[PDB]
Ligand binder design. Structure first.
Ligand SMILES: *[C@@H]1O[C@H](CO)[C@@H](O)[C@H](O)[C@H]1NC(C)=O
Lengths: 50, 43
């Protein structure tokens, strides 16, 4: 966690519907946006912090 | 019986990358040819 990995995602078609239905998630909370609205939203960049 | 690239020394470091894109891999061949390009930085 102190060295959390960050991946920069850009210039690609994000597939939120398939991604959110792939595995089992014990916690899933979105703030400032709904999970299903992302299929209709466009963003400059994405940061994936794992 | 074919040239093979083995040296690339252009930048010493690369930090805080702001874009990256790689096209599909291919083979480059190692009467003339003219390659013209127009580079425009707008908006
Ligand atoms: C990269 O960005 C971070 C914060 O976004 C900053 O602290 C760091 O100094 C930047 N890297 C360089 C080489 O300036």
């Amino acid at each position: 966690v102190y060295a959390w990995n960050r991946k920069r995602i850009s210039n690609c078609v994000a597939d939120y519907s398939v991604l959110y239905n792939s595995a089992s998630f014990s916690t899933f909370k979105c703030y400032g946006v709904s999970p299903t609205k992302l299929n209709d939203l466009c963003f400059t960049n994405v940061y994936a912090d794992s | 019986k074919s040239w093979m690239e083995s040296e690339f020394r252009v930048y010493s470091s690369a930090n805080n990358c702001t874009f990256e894109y790689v096209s599909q891999p291919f083979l480059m061949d190692l009467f003339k040819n003219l390659r013209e390009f127009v580079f425009k930085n707008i908006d």
